[PDB]
Design a protein around this nucleic acid. Structure first.
Lengths: 204, 127, 61, 421, 41, 133, 45, 97
RNA sequence: GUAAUCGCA
DNA sequence: ACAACTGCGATTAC
DNA sequence: TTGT
């Protein structure tokens, strides 16, 4: 606990499921400049500030980043105790926030604008920690690869980051069918294992 | 009627039943309106259990599990595609929900449309 | 519809003419039978309704 | 194009109706038209005299802010979560005298509370400049009021508001409270909205029947009248507030739907709570210390007033048109004028003439007491087309009181004339 | 309902008076039952 | 309800209020202490009851209106419905390996010999590819 | 405002949905909703 | 506005569900339904006593309900009575399955 | 009008 | 001493 | 009969 109440007007307020993250914002025309020198984490809608867990080397200079949100929608069924009581309740339930630095700190309105997928900072509400993501560049070109053709694939609950070309992508139907087929194969093998003839058998 | 409703809302073959080989080595129909999908089903273009994509107008009323996106595609220009289990939510750099597409069958949309149209016809006939 | 002879007789006339059917106030033939039976068994039974206005007892036969 | 009170104004924004509509608010037969004074409700259909009331508005409970009157503070539109210090602020108030403070705090929290109808409805609420309440008034307006009692009461209410803001909204208060009313002007405006648009009705939800103070949207856009066309009824089954036209009354297209606030109060209470004044108020009281007494029966006869002292109306059926001098002003006069009734003794013309001349002298004295005249007030009013709403309300109150005194004089003169027939 | 003759003889010897505040009492008498529409309020 | 429920200064529900599923959920969430409710037991008469003592009507979902006969209804609602050693199995084919010194010999009720177990033991089903415990 | 269901509907789910519809829209709308549901069910069966 | 809701509203109006909707609307404004039933019965009795020959194919109770609905701002046919314009001829009656 | 006997759901 | 499902329909026998 |  810092024990002093900061002025949240000069900070970036990022809301999470169980936490609120504050990052100092330098004066800028477009609110996309972040200062990672001063940062605080608070309980949900609480004015008791604290120091977050810095688990990775944080940038010590002003950088222009793009915020994103990661989570799952919780569509519940609230009890109906009134005539016009709502039939459903939908919540975004953000879990991880991704900060993607702009290439060369360029503005969004510039003629050449690209996102630097090599410097990703994630924020976790469960662990109350901010760390730097580990990406696996696989696009040919090394460090001279053009940033106008890049695709960042995020899987495994925000733990796997890969940079692949834009043309080499899979449609949503493909990945959905892949995961469904994998789960179905695993469950079918689990079900058929208990049969006394599973040993002398063949999956066709 | 219970049997009919169960056949409507049962679902589709999802895993090994729908495909013989893993799609790793390698759904299709896209309908803007529910009326188009129902007309295609009446014209026998798509089967009852055949999967399809239906565009929704920013409602997010589909009940589903609390599961993170299985895969997220983020391009340089700022638009990131979030692929979920049963729906696709395209967004832009401004954190604006551009498009939402639900992955379902003609049975669920038929049940939803018939209930909604019953309510709306009651409300209209009242006046 | 079951037992009230007078009311039933009047029901056909009121339906053919079209007038409203009044509510019967007399006891049905089943109750009257009971009274007769019980009084054959030397037991009395009287309705004896009392008016709340003037506190008078009126027997219904 | 027939000239109607609705035609002179302009139609309101479509959005104003729409936000309510998507939330189940329903309006039948009425139109919302905006104007220089503010929003108002007008008819759009010809309604013949009906056997029973007709519902023009159906307002759900989920769009309203309601606080119970008695000590257990029950928020049936429960937007305040448990443990929030806004409830600690609300509860730390006297139950009987101060009720606008709790409504103001609830309105501020509703403005803060997300996915709330009041967040969108506040844009259509009158701003600090558009508001006509005397809480948002300068000392110049209170001095122009020319009434020491009313100015003192309004200054005391403003002081109470400032003291409450300074006590509850201190520096050590949490940020969730501080963001509600960062400046005291916001809290004063919230109190103004609460006082000027409060409804006191008895409501039944489930099995509990209680009386409460509610802030109901789309029902505060109806103007005030002493001969109302509608009233606020409550429906417990659908849990909605319904505005119903009075039965047996004929409403034509273009008429303005009106409801009555504080039936039986003087212009002082109206000017205090809603910042409004009416020249035809039938409940105005003029303190006359003259020993003279007019005859009440002959007065009501010559002015064709019929009914008990608790219900006075002009019998226009006996009136046969003609006399339109009769209105709420003469009714309030007959109520306030000193009167004598002794069985069936007939009045004496000489005694009544002496009485009316003494009353006219006292009225001329009271009129000379104010350092202004009706013509000067009217000229000052027309000289300033655009000005502070509070100053306009003050000069209108002065003009209304002066016109009431003048009409009392004229009514006494007409009585003196017509008594000798 | 079970022992008609016994309760009848007992009420006859006592001289009991029954006020028709029940349903079957008005049913036997053939009158309006004080339930629902028969309840005057 | 017959008494107010208080969680600190705030009152969750006052007297003469009809409990609902939302109120019950709030009570079980806030871990409410014994709650005073109205019931046909606490009524002041045996020939008749009142709306508050009975509560919500089963038909529509509001207070019972005056003139309703709840006695007959209860009788019918009670009469009409009046008409109406786990065995562990081998997960796969294989050999069983366990320490016999911990188990005590005994005779089963089926006349078969067996090992009595009284302490947590781990047995391994040794199969072609996997081990099960 | 109604939810969209992507799961199998059974007797208990139908009873829950009918109870919720009776609570929200009332019995009047629920009657027509149930008639339309019966028609669609018979058609699909 | 849904595009393909003409026949549904037509069938709702023709069948008589309007009567059920009006009954629900009139019961949503009454504490005790039994007193409402008694009031409707008394009003229908007065209507019958006023004009006997008027009724016989038109129901007085439906007439009372239609008058109460029309006095509330909702247009309803008198006694909810409608005739089939597509009738073939006299003596021909529709068969409602 | 009462019994006996069977059936019905 | 007392009571032990609700009604309906058919026949023959008095 | 079965139990009251």
């Amino acid at each position: 606990i810092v024990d002093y109440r900061i002025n949240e007007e000069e900070f970036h307020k990022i809301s999470l499921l169980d936490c609120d993250f504050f990052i100092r914002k330098p004066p800028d025309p477009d609110n996309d400049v972040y200062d990672f020198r001063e940062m605080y984490v608070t309980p949900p809608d609480t004015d008791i500030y604290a120091i977050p867990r810095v688990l990775a080397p944080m940038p010590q200079k002003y950088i222009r980043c793009a915020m994103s949100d990661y989570g799952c929608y919780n569509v519940t069924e609230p009890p109906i105790d009134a005539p016009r009581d709502p039939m459903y309740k939908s919540e975004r339930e953000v879990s991880k926030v991704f900060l993607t630095k702009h290439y060369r700190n360029r503005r969004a309105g510039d003629p050449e604008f690209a996102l630097d997928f090599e410097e990703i900072y994630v924020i976790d509400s469960k662990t109350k920690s901010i760390t730097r993501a580990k990406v696996v560049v696989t696009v040919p070109g090394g460090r001279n690869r053009d940033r106008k053709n890049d695709l960042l694939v995020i899987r495994d609950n925000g733990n796997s980051f890969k940079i692949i070309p834009s043309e080499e992508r899979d449609d949503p139907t493909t990945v959905i069918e892949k995961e469904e087929w994998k789960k179905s194969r695993q469950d079918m093998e689990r079900h058929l294992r208990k049969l006394r003839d599973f040993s002398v058998s063949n999956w066709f | 009627m219970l049997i009919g409703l169960y056949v409507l809302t049962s679902g589709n073959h999802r895993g090994i039943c729908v495909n013989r080989y893993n799609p790793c080595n390698r759904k299709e129909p896209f309908f803007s309106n529910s009326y188009d999908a129902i007309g295609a089903y009446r014209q026998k273009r798509i089967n009852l259990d055949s999967p399809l994509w239906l565009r929704w107008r920013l409602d997010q009323r589909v009940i589903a599990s609390r599961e993170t996106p299985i895969e997220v595609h983020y391009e340089s220009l700022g638009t990131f595609y979030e692929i979920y289990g049963h729906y696709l939510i395209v967004r832009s750099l401004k954190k604006q929900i551009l498009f939402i597409y639900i992955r379902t069958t003609v049975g669920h949309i038929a049940l939803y449309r018939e209930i909604e149209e019953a309510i709306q016809g009651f409300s209209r006939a009242y006046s | 519809k079951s037992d009230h002879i007078r009311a039933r007789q009047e029901v056909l006339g009121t339906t053919i003419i079209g007038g409203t059917i009044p509510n019967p106030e007399d006891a049905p033939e089943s109750f009257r039978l009971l009274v007769r039976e019980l009084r054959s068994l030397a037991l009395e039974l009287n309705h004896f309704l009392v008016s709340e206005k003037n506190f008078q007892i009126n027997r219904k036969e | 194009p027939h000239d109607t009170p609705a035609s002179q104004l302009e139609l309101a924004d479509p959005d104003f109706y729409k936000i309510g509509y998507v939330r189940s608010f329903r309006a039948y037969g009425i139109e919302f038209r905006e104007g220089p004074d503010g929003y108002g409700v007008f008819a759009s259909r010809d309604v013949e005299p009906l056997r029973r009331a007709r519902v023009i508005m159906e307002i759900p409970l989920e769009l309203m802010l309601t606080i119970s009157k008695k000590l257990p503070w029950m928020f049936f539109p429960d937007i305040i979560p448990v443990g929030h210090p806004i409830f600690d602020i609300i509860n730390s108030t006297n139950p009987e005298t101060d009720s606008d403070l709790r409504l103001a705090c609830l309105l501020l929290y509703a403005f803060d509370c997300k996915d709330n109808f009041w967040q969108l409805y506040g844009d259509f609420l009158p701003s600090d400049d558009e508001c006509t309440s005397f809480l948002l008034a300068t000392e110049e307006d209170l001095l122009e009021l020319q009434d020491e009692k009313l100015a003192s009461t309004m200054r005391e209410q403003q002081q109470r508001a400032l003291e409450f803001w300074e006590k509850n909204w201190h520096s050590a208060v949490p940020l969730k409270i501080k963001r509600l009313a960062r400046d005291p002007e916001r809290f004063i405006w919230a109190m103004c909205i609460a006082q000027s648009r409060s409804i006191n009705l008895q409501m039944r939800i489930g099995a509990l029947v209680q009386d409460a103070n509610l802030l109901v949207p789309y029902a505060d856009m109806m103007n005030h009248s002493f001969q109302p066309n509608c009233f606020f009824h409550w429906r417990f089954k659908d849990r909605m507030l319904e505005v119903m036209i009075n039965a047996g009354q004929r409403i034509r297209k273009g008429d303005e739907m009106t409801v009555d606030y504080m039936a039986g109060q003087k212009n002082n209470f109206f000017m205090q709570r809603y910042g409004f004044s009416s020249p035809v108020n039938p409940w105005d009281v003029i303190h006359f210390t003259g020993d003279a007494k007019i005859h009440l029966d002959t007065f009501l006869s010559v002015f064709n007033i019929s009914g008990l002292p608790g219900e006075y109306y002009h019998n226009s059926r006996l009136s046969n048109d003609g006399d339109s001098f009769v209105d709420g002003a003469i009714i309030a006069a007959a109520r306030t004028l000193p009167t004598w009734s002794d069985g069936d003794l007939p009045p004496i013309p000489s005694l009544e003439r002496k009485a009316v001349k003494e009353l006219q002298e006292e009225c001329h004295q009271m009129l000379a007491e104010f350092p202004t005249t009706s013509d000067e007030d009217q000229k000052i009013l027309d000289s300033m087309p655009d000005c502070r709403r509070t100053l306009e309300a003050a000069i209108k109150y002065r003009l209304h009181r002066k016109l009431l005194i003048e009409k009392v004089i004229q009514a006494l003169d007409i009585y003196q004339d017509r008594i000798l027939f | 309902f079970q022992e008609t003759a016994r309760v009848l003889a007992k009420a006859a010897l006592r001289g009991r008076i029954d006020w028709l505040k029940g349903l079957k009492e008005n049913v036997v008498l053939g009158g309006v039952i004080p339930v629902g529409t028969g309840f005057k309020g | 309800l017959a008494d107010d429920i208080y969680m600190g200064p705030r009152c969750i529900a006052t007297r003469n209020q009809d409990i609902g599923i939302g109120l019950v959920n709030r009570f079980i969430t806030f871990r409410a202490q014994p709650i005073s409710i109205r019931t046909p037991f606490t009524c002041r008469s045996t020939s008749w009851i009142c709306r508050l003592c009975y509560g919500r009507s089963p038909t529509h979902g509001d207070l019972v209106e005056l003139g309703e006969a709840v006695g007959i209804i209860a009788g019918q609602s009670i009469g009409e419905p009046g008409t109406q050693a786990e065995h562990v199995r081998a997960p796969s084919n294989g050999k069983i390996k366990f320490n016999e010194d911990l188990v005590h010999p005994t005779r089963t009720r089926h006349g078969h010999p067996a090992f009595l177990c009284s302490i947590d033991l781990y047995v391994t089903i040794e199969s072609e590819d996997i081990l099960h415990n | 405002n109604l939810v969209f269901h992507n799961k199998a509907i059974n007797g208990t789910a139908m009873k829950r949905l009918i109870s919720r519809l009776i609570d929200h829209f009332g019995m009047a709308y629920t009657s027509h909703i149930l008639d339309q549901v019966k028609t669609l069910g018979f058609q699909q069966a | 506005r849904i595009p393909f809701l003409e026949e549904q509203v037509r069938k709702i109006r023709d069948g008589g569900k309007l009567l059920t909707m009006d009954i629900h609307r009139l019961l949503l404004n009454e504490d005790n339904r039994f007193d409402f039933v008694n009031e409707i019965a008394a009003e229908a009795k007065q209507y019958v006593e006023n004009n006997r020959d008027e009724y016989g194919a038109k129901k007085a109770i439906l007439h009372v309900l239609s008058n109460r609905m029309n006095d509330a701002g909702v247009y309803r046919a008198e006694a909810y009575m409608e005739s089939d314009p597509f009738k073939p001829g006299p003596g021909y009656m529709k068969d409602e399955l």
